[PDB]
Structures are given as C-alpha cells and as structure tokens.
Amino acid sequence: VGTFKAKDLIVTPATILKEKPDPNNLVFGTVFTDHMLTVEWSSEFGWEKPHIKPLQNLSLHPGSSALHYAVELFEGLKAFRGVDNKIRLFQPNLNMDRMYRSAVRATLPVFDKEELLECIQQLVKLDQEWVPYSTSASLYIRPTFIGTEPSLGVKKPTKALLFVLLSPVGPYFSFNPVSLWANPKYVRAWKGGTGDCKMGGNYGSSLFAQCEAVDNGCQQVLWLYGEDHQITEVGTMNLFLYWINEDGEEELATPPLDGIILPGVTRRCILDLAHQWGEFKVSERYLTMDDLTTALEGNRVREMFGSGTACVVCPVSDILYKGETIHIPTMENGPKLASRILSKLTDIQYGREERDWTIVLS
C-alpha cells in the first residue's frame, strides 16, 4: 500500500504540437491534446513515478486483464476557461473519491487522491491552451485505470496503468431535448452489482440497447429496473423528475442510491442547490413508469431531465414505451427549473460567481 507523488512528476514535452480545433466544430471525445499522464504500478515495487509525456498509443501485453475481464474504471470531469480567463476545475475532489472507491471495487490498487488531483492539474496546466476560448466549450478530463497483468488468470491484478487523457469538447447542444427508449428487456445494473461505480463493465453491456435506441430515433436509453419498471437513469445521466407528487406537493424527485444508481457529481450539486433554495420538496425516492403515466394523465409533471458532466442538464421531451410515444411537457414548462440549474452551474464553472465548488488551476 503506497502512492505516486506529484513532486516526482517527470515531464517530457512534445516537440511537435498539434493545431487546436475550432471551438464551435467540436465532436465530443474525438480530439486529444498534446500530452497525457501515465503512472505504472506493480504488486512487487508499487507505484512508479508519474509521467507527463506526449499522447501516444499504449503498449499492452495482449494478455492484459483490461482486455479479457474488463479490469478497468474511468472518470469524467472538466476544466473551464473563465470570463476572467482563469481556468477552473469543478468539484474535482468528488471525482477522486469516486475513482478511489471504483478502484477498491475493481481490486485495482489504491492511490493518494490529492497526489492524483495535483498530477491532473499539472497536465491541464501544461496543455492549458487546449482549454477552449469559449463560454460554451470545456476541456474533458478522462482519468482511466486498467489491469495490465500479462496472464489469463482470474485474479487481483499484479500490474496496472493509471493514465489521464484531455479532450476539448463543445456544448452538448450544438436546449435540444432527448427522446428516451424504454425497453424492460435490458437491465443496466442489479443489486449486488457494480452499477454504483464507474467501472468499464457497466457500459459494454449497455451498448446494444443504445444502438437499438438510436435505431428508433432516441438519443438515450431509459434504464428500467424490477417488476414495477422503476425509472433509474437517463442513459449515461442521473434522472430528475420535477412534478406535483401524490400528496399534491411540488417536488424534485430522483432515484435513491440503493446500489443501481451511479452517484453523479451533477446529481449531488442539483440536490444541494434544491435543498439550499428550500422552495419545494426534495425526495430521493422510487419512481415507476406507472407513477409517471399517472402523473402525466393528471397534468402533475413539469420537467424531466438527465444530469451529468457532459450535458449539466438534458431535458427529456418523450419516452418510447410498449409501442407508444409518451410526451413529457418539459419544454412547455420553460423548462424553468432545468434553465435555473444550467444557469447556476454554468455561472460557477466559468467564474461568473465565486464558489466553494471550483479550484483555480495550479
């Protein structure tokens, strides 16, 4: 049990630098910056010194457990060029906490969260000109952690690689609301599974349903669970419902963290803002398709949206379920709460207001 240290960083600058992309013509996760972070681990010697070096292919033994048994996890967070031209991270300590927890569940080696964050800051700082000159674009940060043991054995890995990629990304909407594909045949996560960690294995099994969604003109899967068809996640995003509940109370509701919900940073921020405002009830509670269709019949639904680093908030206009299209009146209700949340989080991200939730770059 040990850690790499940022003070040990070895920095090999690229001698040929790539042209930055047009900030308006950015496709998510396709353009990479000049440099990457790599840190090697072995059970025999522990963590090697961390390296910032030119973006390169990984050289992996074809037996690597990441390729056979998905011994792997990732994170997603962003750097933002402020209205004051200062680059900020947003709640990055929550990403480090989740990455450490995911590592323990994956049986990958633990590391010092502060040392990783400082290595990430030094990587962003070196490639800081890649943080887009735009109030609607950002630099996506992809910490990734893979088993690299050259053996086919099913066992705790004795070799691993922690790396970080940087990708300039545009606004999710280049509010264009999403249509959701609701097919109960496919289950994202089960009680006693890894659905509450950002482990690669949760996503490979989800691709088929996503291609079926797209084949039916939908952008995301509505992940249903159990005999009562609980609504759990809006594809890669946490699920919020703003409605009049069964007791006639104005309520912001989201599924509870009972093992099948990824605990989103954005979700946490939205719940914290909603509690802070104290203008309506805030409930972590089960929501079923029946609860939703009963509410829609009673004109009790105001807004439905996903939350995530990639979108901030993603309004939902429609659900395809049992061969019918179910309208959700989000965009006919402003969407007032969705807009307020987007405006608040964006104002914090781009330094339009001071917050405990941002760190100015190292």
Ligand X SMILES: *Cc1c(COP(=O)(O)O)cnc(C)c1O
Positions that interact with ligand X (CB under 6 A)? 76, 198, 233, 236-238, 262, 264-267, 307-309
Q: Which residues pair with 46 in a beta bridge?
A: 42
Contacting residues for 130 by C-beta, under 8 A, at least 6 apart: 20, 33, 34, 139, 166, 168
| Closest CB 133 distance from a second copy, rounded Å | 22
Q: Which residue number, 95 or 202, has a Cβ lying nearer to a second copy?
A: 202
Return the closest-CA partner of residue 86 out of 127, 55, 131, 46. 131
Q: Which residue number, 112 or 258, has a Cβ lying nearer to Mg ion?
A: 112
Considering CB distances under 5 to 8 angstroms, the limit depending on partner class, which of ligand X, Mg ion, a second copy, none binds residue 265? Answer: ligand X
Q: Using an 8 Å Cβ cutoff, are 132 and 33 in contact?
A: no
Q: Which three-class secondary structure state does DSSP give residue 104? A: helix
The Cα 66–Cα 60 span in angstroms is: 10
Considering CB distances under 5 to 8 angstroms, the limit depending on partner class, which of ligand X, ligand UU2, a second copy, none binds residue 238? Answer: ligand X
Considering CB distances under 5 to 8 angstroms, the limit depending on partner class, which of a second copy, Mg ion, ligand UU2, none binds residue 60? Answer: a second copy
Q: Which residue number, 100 or 203, has a Cβ lying nearer to a second copy?
A: 203
| Closest CB 342 distance from ligand UU2, rounded Å | 15
Here the tokens at position 282 are 């805030």
Considering CB distances under 5 to 8 angstroms, the limit depending on partner class, which of ligand X, a second copy, Mg ion, none binds residue 112? Answer: Mg ion
Binding site for a second copy (CB under 8 A): 27-30, 32, 36, 55-64, 66-72, 74, 105-107, 140, 142, 144, 146, 150-156, 163, 165, 167, 173, 184-187, 190-194, 199-208, 210-211, 214, 235-236
Here the tokens at position 262 are 């990824």
Considering CB distances under 5 to 8 angstroms, the limit depending on partner class, which of ligand UU2, a second copy, ligand X, none binds residue 233? Answer: ligand X
Q: Which residue number, 310 or 338, has a Cβ lying nearer to ligand UU2?
A: 310
Return the closest-CA partner of residue 310 out of 259, 264, 252. 264
Q: Which residues pair with 88 in a beta bridge?
A: 80, 360
| Closest CB 123 distance from Mg ion, rounded Å | 19
Q: Which residue number, 249 or 272, has a Cβ lying nearer to ligand X?
A: 272
Q: Which residue number, 35 or 267, has a Cβ lying nearer to ligand X?
A: 267
Contacting residues for 288 by C-beta, under 8 A, at least 6 apart: 228, 229, 230, 231
The Cα 231–Cα 237 span in angstroms is: 12
Q: Which three-class secondary structure state does DSSP give residue 13? A: coil
Binding site for ligand UU2 (CB under 6 A): 28-29, 76, 152-154, 172-173, 178, 203, 210, 214, 219-220, 235-236, 308-310
Q: Which residue number, 98 or 159, has a Cβ lying nearer to ligand X?
A: 98
| Closest CB 91 distance from ligand X, rounded Å | 8
Total residues at interface with Mg ion (CB under 5 A): 1
Roughly what angle, to the nearest 10 degrees, separates helices 92-106 and 113-126? 120
- Give the other-Cβ count within 10 Å of 59's Cβ: 7
Considering CB distances under 5 to 8 angstroms, the limit depending on partner class, which of ligand X, a second copy, ligand UU2, none binds residue 57? Answer: a second copy
The Cα 20–Cα 170 span in angstroms is: 13
Asked if 112 interacts with Mg ion (CB under 5 A), we say yes
Give the C-alpha distances (Å, rounded to integers) separating 215 from 61, 221, 242: 36, 12, 29
Binding site for Mg ion (CB under 5 A): 112
